[PDB]
Every structure is written in C-alpha cells, then in structure tokens.
Scaffold this active site. Structure first.
Site, PDB file in Angstrom:
ATOM      1  N   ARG A 122     117.870  -1.105   2.656  1.00 35.21           N
ATOM      2  CA  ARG A 122     118.996  -1.922   2.202  1.00 35.21           C
ATOM      3  C   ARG A 122     119.446  -2.825   3.349  1.00 35.21           C
ATOM      4  NH1 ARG A 122     123.693   0.896  -1.594  1.00 35.21           N
ATOM      5  NH2 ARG A 122     122.284   1.577  -3.271  1.00 35.21           N
ATOM      6  N   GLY A 123     118.894  -4.034   3.406  1.00 32.68           N
ATOM      7  CA  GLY A 123     119.193  -4.981   4.466  1.00 32.68           C
ATOM      8  C   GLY A 123     120.552  -5.653   4.416  1.00 32.68           C
TER       9      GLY A 123
ATOM     10  N   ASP B 271     113.047 -15.027  17.133  1.00 32.59           N
ATOM     11  CA  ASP B 271     113.697 -13.710  17.163  1.00 32.59           C
ATOM     12  C   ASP B 271     112.776 -12.529  17.499  1.00 32.59           C
ATOM     13  OD1 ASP B 271     115.920 -12.037  17.202  1.00 32.59           O
ATOM     14  OD2 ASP B 271     116.070 -11.919  15.022  1.00 32.59           O
TER      15      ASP B 271
ATOM     16  N   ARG C  26     112.948  -4.528  17.022  1.00 32.60           N
ATOM     17  CA  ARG C  26     113.414  -4.199  15.671  1.00 32.60           C
ATOM     18  C   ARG C  26     112.721  -5.056  14.619  1.00 32.60           C
ATOM     19  NH1 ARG C  26     117.573  -7.545  18.371  1.00 32.60           N
ATOM     20  NH2 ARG C  26     117.391  -9.541  17.275  1.00 32.60           N
ATOM     21  N   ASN C  27     112.084  -6.143  15.059  1.00 32.18           N
ATOM     22  CA  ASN C  27     111.376  -7.062  14.159  1.00 32.18           C
ATOM     23  C   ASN C  27     109.871  -6.785  14.147  1.00 32.18           C
ATOM     24  OD1 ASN C  27     113.274  -8.821  12.855  1.00 32.18           O
ATOM     25  ND2 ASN C  27     113.546  -9.982  14.755  1.00 32.18           N
TER      26      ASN C  27
ATOM     27  N   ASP D 123     109.573 -10.567  10.842  1.00 29.03           N
ATOM     28  CA  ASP D 123     110.965 -11.028  10.821  1.00 29.03           C
ATOM     29  C   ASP D 123     111.726 -10.537   9.608  1.00 29.03           C
ATOM     30  OD1 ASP D 123     113.417 -12.360  11.398  1.00 29.03           O
ATOM     31  OD2 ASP D 123     112.325 -14.055  12.266  1.00 29.03           O
TER      32      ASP D 123
HETATM   33  O1  LIG Z   1     110.208 -10.753   4.597  1.00 23.31           O
HETATM   34  C1  LIG Z   1     109.660 -10.697   5.693  1.00 23.31           C
HETATM   35  N1  LIG Z   1     109.488  -9.554   6.506  1.00 23.31           N
HETATM   36  C2  LIG Z   1     109.722  -8.248   6.266  1.00 23.31           C
HETATM   37  C3  LIG Z   1     109.547  -7.381   7.374  1.00 23.31           C
HETATM   38  C4  LIG Z   1     109.766  -5.979   7.159  1.00 23.31           C
HETATM   39  C5  LIG Z   1     110.149  -5.435   5.872  1.00 23.31           C
HETATM   40  O2  LIG Z   1     110.354  -4.060   5.574  1.00 23.31           O
HETATM   41  C6  LIG Z   1     109.157  -3.219   5.414  1.00 23.31           C
HETATM   42  C7  LIG Z   1     107.843  -3.708   5.060  1.00 23.31           C
HETATM   43  C8  LIG Z   1     106.769  -2.794   4.961  1.00 23.31           C
HETATM   44  N2  LIG Z   1     107.060  -1.441   5.201  1.00 23.31           N
HETATM   45  C9  LIG Z   1     108.273  -0.942   5.519  1.00 23.31           C
HETATM   46  N3  LIG Z   1     108.580   0.361   5.775  1.00 23.31           N
HETATM   47  C10 LIG Z   1     109.986   0.407   6.078  1.00 23.31           C
HETATM   48  C11 LIG Z   1     110.559  -0.941   6.026  1.00 23.31           C
HETATM   49  C12 LIG Z   1     109.384  -1.760   5.652  1.00 23.31           C
HETATM   50  C13 LIG Z   1     110.309  -6.369   4.821  1.00 23.31           C
HETATM   51  F1  LIG Z   1     110.660  -5.815   3.598  1.00 23.31           F
HETATM   52  C14 LIG Z   1     110.106  -7.793   5.015  1.00 23.31           C
HETATM   53  C15 LIG Z   1     109.152 -11.938   6.274  1.00 23.31           C
HETATM   54  C16 LIG Z   1     109.344 -13.133   5.593  1.00 23.31           C
HETATM   55  C17 LIG Z   1     108.926 -14.375   6.119  1.00 23.31           C
HETATM   56  C18 LIG Z   1     108.273 -14.477   7.363  1.00 23.31           C
HETATM   57  N4  LIG Z   1     108.049 -13.350   8.043  1.00 23.31           N
HETATM   58  C19 LIG Z   1     107.418 -13.444   9.254  1.00 23.31           C
HETATM   59  C20 LIG Z   1     106.101 -12.846   9.518  1.00 23.31           C
HETATM   60  C21 LIG Z   1     105.453 -12.916  10.805  1.00 23.31           C
HETATM   61  C22 LIG Z   1     106.244 -13.621  11.764  1.00 23.31           C
HETATM   62  F2  LIG Z   1     105.644 -13.652  12.853  1.00 23.31           F
HETATM   63  C23 LIG Z   1     107.529 -14.205  11.572  1.00 23.31           C
HETATM   64  C24 LIG Z   1     108.133 -14.117  10.286  1.00 23.31           C
HETATM   65  C25 LIG Z   1     108.456 -11.993   7.614  1.00 23.31           C
HETATM   66  O3  LIG Z   1     108.216 -10.978   8.359  1.00 23.31           O
END
Ligand SMILES: O=C(Nc1ccc(Oc2ccnc3[nH]ccc23)c(F)c1)c1cccn(-c2ccc(F)cc2)c1=O
Length: 293
Positions: A33-34, A151, A155-156, A169
């Site tokens: 829940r972000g 960023d 945490r990212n 991100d």
């Molecule tokens: O919507 C994004 N990202 C995101 C990141 C983490 C998230 O949460 C999870 C995903 C998988 N398993 C999990 N288990 C627990 C939590 C969790 C999650 F829902 C979304 C995203 C959008 C646009 C650009 N980019 C992006 C990529 C490379 C980059 F280098 C810069 C930006 C992103 O990352």
C-alpha cells in the site's frame, strides 16, 4: 476517452498490451500500500506451459484523463529497459470494461533496504559489496542510454529469489518532498539533474549497505543539508567498511561534478575490491542506529 490522447505517440501502448484471457488480479492479497499506487498480488497466464507470478499496478477507470496520462507515460519508459540489474514492465493490458493494465515481475525478497535490516539475516562484507557492484552495473547501462534516474536509493532497488538486485522507482520540488539527503550540491543549489549527480547518489547507497540500512545524516534537518555540507562534511566510515571502498565514496562526492568517476570506472574499481575477499567476515548492526528512523 480513447479518441483520445496522443494518437500517434500513445500507440506504443500497443505492444505493451495483453491478450483476451490471460490475467487475474486478486485484492484479498495485497503486496502492500504505497500512496497513489496500485500494489497488489497478481496472477498472469503466459501463453501456456508457463505460470508467471507478478506485481500488479494498474490505475482506476474513470479517474479522469489528464492524471491518467502521466501514468501510462511513466510505464512506457521501461520499454527498452533490458538489463539484468534493471527492473522492467511485463506489459499493459487495457481492458474494455475494467481498465488499462500494468505488470511488473514479482520479487520474492522485496526492497533492498528492508532485506539488510532484518535481524534474522546474516550478510557478510562480501555479500554487501556485491549488492553495490550490481547497482553500478545497472547504472552503467542506464547512463549509456542517456537516462537520468533522479532517485537512486536502496529503497528503490529490488531483490528476487536468486539474490539479483534490480534498480527501480516506486511510482513538491523545493525543501521537503525531494530526497535531499541523496542529492549533490549543484542539484540542491540549482535544481537540475544529471548522470554526474546520480554518481553522488550512488555513494550514499554504498553507505546504507555497509551500515545495514542506517539512515544518512540522522542529526541534520533536510532544510539545512546544503549548509551542513558546505562546512566541509561527508558521511563517516562505517565500522565494517574497507579502507579502499571509503576512498571510492569520497570520490563520488567530489566538489566538481566533472572530476567524479563514471559508472564505468566504478564497476571496474569495485570488482577489484570485491575480488580480494572470501567470506569470513560478518556484519553486525550498530546499537546506536538500531530503532532509528
Ligand atoms: O512502477 C514502477 N516500479 C515499481 C517498483 C516496485 C514495486 O513493488 C513490487 C514489485 C515486484 N515485487 C514486489 N514485492 C514487494 C513489492 C514489490 C512496484 F509495484 C512498482 C516503475 C514505473 C516506471 C518506471 N520504473 C522504473 C524502472 C527502472 C528505473 F530504472 C527507473 C524507473 C519503475 O520502477
């Protein structure tokens, strides 16, 4: 409305789209829940002979149209993000009577910061130096495509079942709202972001790793980080950090942006440091950092 937005630009959203029957998004199962992000467990039916588990982040239906664009716009960035140390999107299946979708592969271990903080885990000096090397690889790749993160922080960054780190991100701009504690001088002063300012950020990330997720500059307020630095200050050497690796953090925080090493030279320099360890040294948590936000 689909008639529309940018009928020649938002055509890329064609490739990133799923077929008729091939998805199931559970809400009883919540990935978290972000804030303004749809983080729930998700099931995907990939063609066949394949069972893919993923993270689902698709936004509401009649939300609007001007706030909807900014979204489908950021999901497209990842179109050509194909490196093993970078996160990428599985697709975007836009429903007829539901909403347009989004998909990110599931990471078993979640966010890098939370993993290092768990007391039931036991990383060594080599483990941690290795997590840092992996981030430098992804940044060298993004740097070559002329892409500025803005960023970079632990945490990212994400972690999967094999222990492979993936940069990502988690979807105001003055004083408080930005990550002032990971920002370079020139950035704080003028508010302009570059790759050389990503290098500054990378050195703070290497600090978080060696303290096992401690917060940087715990005694100083975000409103006055520029003033604190400008007195001639940098973060201290962690207890379990090697001499040569601290010399590298100092270089990432160089006063003149053009004197900082590149991500290419960082990968090179860090692989040597890494290569001199076997794995007989355990990193324990600082009592004073314990229970501090
Ligand atoms: O919507 C994004 N990202 C995101 C990141 C983490 C998230 O949460 C999870 C995903 C998988 N398993 C999990 N288990 C627990 C939590 C969790 C999650 F829902 C979304 C995203 C959008 C646009 C650009 N980019 C992006 C990529 C490379 C980059 F280098 C810069 C930006 C992103 O990352």
């Amino acid at each position: 409305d689909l008639s529309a937005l940018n009928p020649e630009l938002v055509q890329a959203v064609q490739h990133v789209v799923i077929g008729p029957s091939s998805l199931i998004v559970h809400f009883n199962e919540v990935i978290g829940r972000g804030h303004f992000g749809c983080v729930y467990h998700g099931t995907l039916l990939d063609n066949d002979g394949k069972k893919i588990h993923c993270a689902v982040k698709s936004l509401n239906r009649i939300t609007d149209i001007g706030e909807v664009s900014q979204f489908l716009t950021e999901g497209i960035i990842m179109k050509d993000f194909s490196h093993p140390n970078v996160l990428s999107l599985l697709g975007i299946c836009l429903r007829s009577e539901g909403s347009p979708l989004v998909v990110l592969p599931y990471m078993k271990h979640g966010d890098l910061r939370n993993f290092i903080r768990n007391e039931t885990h036991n990383p060594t000096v080599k483990d941690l130096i290795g997590f840092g090397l992996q981030v430098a690889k992804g940044m060298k790749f993004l740097a070559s495509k002329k892409f500025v993160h803005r960023d970079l922080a632990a945490r990212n960054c994400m972690l999967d079942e094999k222990f492979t780190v993936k940069v990502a991100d988690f979807g105001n701009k003055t004083g408080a709202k930005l990550p002032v504690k990971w920002m370079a001088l020139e950035s704080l002063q003028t508010q302009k972001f570059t790759t050389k300012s990503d290098v500054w950020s990378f050195g703070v990330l290497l600090w978080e790793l060696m303290t096992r997720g401690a917060p940087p500059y715990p005694d100083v307020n975000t409103f006055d980080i520029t003033v604190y630095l400008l007195q001639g200050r940098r973060l201290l050497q962690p207890e379990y950090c090697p001499d040569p690796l601290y010399e590298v953090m100092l270089k990432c925080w160089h006063p003149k942006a053009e004197m900082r090493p590149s991500f290419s030279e960082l990968v090179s320099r860090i692989s040597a440091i890494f290569s001199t360890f076997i794995g007989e040294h355990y990193v324990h948590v600082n009592a004073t950092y314990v229970n501090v936000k």
